[PDB]
Design a binder for this molecule. Structure first.
Ligand SMILES: Clc1ccc([C@H]2C[C@@H]3CC[C@H]2N3)cn1
Ligand SMILES: Clc1ccc([C@H]2C[C@@H]3CC[C@H]2N3)cn1
Ligand SMILES: Clc1ccc([C@H]2C[C@@H]3CC[C@H]2N3)cn1
Ligand SMILES: Clc1ccc([C@H]2C[C@@H]3CC[C@H]2N3)cn1
Ligand SMILES: Clc1ccc([C@H]2C[C@@H]3CC[C@H]2N3)cn1
Lengths: 214, 213, 214, 214, 214
């Protein structure tokens, strides 16, 4: 049964080939082919809050899900391969960007996604973000409140739509011994209009109330 | 399903037919001058280091230009009016801050939008450290600083700049920033440099600011 | 005279060619072809502990080992070459990622591995890591305790399995005059489940007890 | 004129393709075929003088100019194209290096150079340099005084020679409101010798005298 | 006259280089076919000693020297070309790495090496290194004392050997005005053994004894 191993790999190498070098590179969404990306935020730590610049440093991971008929296949032609991991470079990925960011976002996780036979893609980049947020109040019972919104930078609402599965930011993995404890963190979808462009823009707005321990 | 398949067969076609045959339109020439429109939305003045006289801004810079070479007719492609593309896939203008003091930091996806008339728009969100003496930032008057943005390699006869208005966009300036803005103006300038015979256009960003109170 | 050197080289260039550029795959692990990676940690220095952000900086090396039938050769027909060094780019390498990390990991070693005729691969990246770690207690007899877990970020337990050779993290090479002395450092295998995914995920958890030297 | 821009381009695209793609790119100067770069500095600002490490940070741009015969063409064979801009990684560029630098040089500007028909090339990289410089006295009448030498790292005086246009640094762009006032800034050709190598090495010595701006 | 002579000299060096790389190739040292690098340090400056992390930052240049068969030519087929400069990435270079480093080494110089007709290569990368080093006592008569060993990361004592030209580090270029005076600096050949692997590994041990100025 090392022969069995060899087939499962002949097949995966074939599925991947037939997908990525047959009808090459899906060109991103268009008005005519809109795409909805599901966003979820696991907040792990509020690393730093610089009260003299009003920047705050978060480490989270952001879970992204979309679906593409172009990534669809029947397992029964690929030997019951239901899914597979691939390089995030190998496929179109959504350009989800933090709007109040103040340094380039730092990737903490491997650039790899998982594609399923229904053409559904899931991708979870863990990131360190520095964003505009005024920590005044972080040492009072009330704490301080901060927001940062995540959305497509280039695609409108007619091209990319966003939706969350839940309002509650995942705090189950929040670092126990963090300098700051979480009081609430909500992921909410929003529409904004910008002075650049006629169309609306979907973002998911992350709102975090927090304070120092003791 | 079916209709989706076509509008992507088309997009893959347009993209292909454009970027191949002239892989690289090779940039402007005196023969083929190009004007790029600049706008600045100021988001935040993060930091003002009075000990080094560096100031830190976070803004985004909106760039627009036009290229016959990116021109196409919607009816050739099933009414595709425009599309998103990688910023590496196309020629982009080399707009550089002149009094910058650290490499500019890109905060946005490197992607642009191309329209059927061959007009391109691109908006890099940037964090900039530039030369600026914040003395006065703690007085009613505040402190004034300037930093000029312009092509680094292309002259006025190759790239020209113009702004659609002189007021820097402050509608999205951070409400709880350490510094409040008093005025921010984007104005076109001509300078000459000791390096080169021809004139060089820059858009000069002028910002008066003071500490929030 | 010197001709012998020339053969050993023709033959290494041949083995490498026949392996890499006459492919037959390696697409990474799948359920049908699971892979077990051996992890070992040599802890070199606790560089910094920042009490105000609850971040700690470690310098270690991470010894990885796996096996691949696809990298297997009969040395007889390659001038009796038993192994060779290759660029880590030139092969599939496991995506072993620190979960509590707070800045991207810093590579301190050459991006090179050694492959043996049995298809066994060993790769030891030296790294600087910053992770969520609360140093409170670092200046008491007891010291402070911190954990960081290392695992595949994208491959589950059905694709990648992890195993240590020993529970003892290697302190042989730990800096003598480091700001912090180690009181124990244990590498222990674990299974977690995550909100993202149906299947379990293996990680090796590094647990470090430390305090300020005298 | 639609076509009068298609021709201009096809020519430039072909011109470039003739010089690099079709031509074997020039292997740097030799003792047998030497080369003179002409260096110039525009000093823009002394950003930081750190008297706890004796590092000073300058921001300046360095005008570089050399002539290559491999880079000559006939504007008659390319629709009268007297010159063009191209990326610095398409051509050979001199390795002019700061000798007393303490942090790898930071590029403030795009990596693009201008080539003219007679083969002359100009390159103006803008940079930030941390170099070894005791700033004691920077708060007195007479100020402090600092040197940093630029010159080829690898090529000696028989491969690369240096010229300046003038031994006055370009203070025309010095930041009027800089922490530091410039008192003098001179650039001078020099010959050194080092242990490594038997020939002499040519540098241009930048010497700044400055004080904290009253 | 000279226009032709410099077109010949170039065509030969263009040819010679394309003879050595674009044909004839060298896959690093083997036990079969070993190699000795000769290391030498010119220490230039101790920039920073951070007593809060026990990190020291040196700025030095490292002279590397090895000899390769695959790199020999006869100047009479290549018009008396005794040597040439070429990019480090066109030839094999040793992976001499700092063992006690805390931050990835920073390259202060261009990556170009010199190859002579007898196959010998010289490569002098200039570097900024942060390494593990308790600087206590640095403000006393007797100062502090620190070691950092450089040596191959992957290659054993049977693939790469090391030798130094002298046990004295070059302080003839030490920054006369640095925050730290050097009291001694010696480079010493050493053999280590590690858990990971069976054979000896050779390093050169750099040992610096230093104090703050006055
Ligand atoms: Cl494609 C993808 C992204 C993220 C993940 C997650 C599952 C485990 C836990 C976090 C991360 N690793 C799994 N797969
Ligand atoms: Cl190419 C492009 C088009 C539009 C934009 C803008 C839309 C969202 C909000 C500001 C910025 N991102 C940015 N880039
Ligand atoms: Cl290749 C090149 C040509 C010209 C220039 C110059 C244009 C602006 C002003 C001085 C410098 N930057 C810079 N680089
Ligand atoms: Cl390949 C090579 C040869 C020589 C050098 C040296 C010559 C000058 C002085 C030190 C360094 N720069 C550096 N690299
Ligand atoms: Cl492929 C490989 C082999 C061996 C090693 C190790 C042996 C010496 C000590 C640490 C590192 N260098 C690291 N990587």
């Amino acid at each position: 049964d090392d022969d069995d191993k060899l087939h499962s790999q002949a097949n995966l190498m074939r599925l991947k080939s037939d997908l990525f070098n047959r009808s090459p590179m899906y060109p991103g969404p268009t008005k005519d082919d809109p795409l909805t990306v599901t966003l979820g935020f696991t907040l792990q730590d509020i690393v730093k809050a610089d009260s003299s610049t009003n920047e705050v440093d978060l480490v989270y991971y952001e879970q992204q899900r979309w679906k593409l008929n172009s990534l669809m296949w029947d397992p029964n032609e690929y030997g019951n391969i239901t899914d597979f991991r691939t390089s995030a470079a190998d496929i179109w990925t959504p350009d989800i960007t933090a709007y109040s960011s103040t340094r380039p976002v730092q990737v903490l996780s491997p650039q790899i996604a998982v594609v399923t036979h229904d053409g559904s893609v899931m991708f979870i980049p863990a990131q360190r973000l520095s964003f505009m947020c005024d920590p005044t109040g972080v040492d009072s019972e009330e704490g301080a409140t901060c927001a940062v919104k995540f959305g497509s930078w280039v695609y409108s609402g007619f091209e990319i739509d966003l939706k969350t599965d839940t309002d509650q930011v995942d705090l189950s993995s929040y670092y126990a011994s963090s300098k700051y404890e979480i009081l609430s963190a909500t992921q909410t979808r929003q529409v904004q209009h910008y002075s650049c462009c006629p169309e609306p823009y979907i973002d998911v707005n992350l709102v975090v109330k927090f304070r120092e321990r003791r």
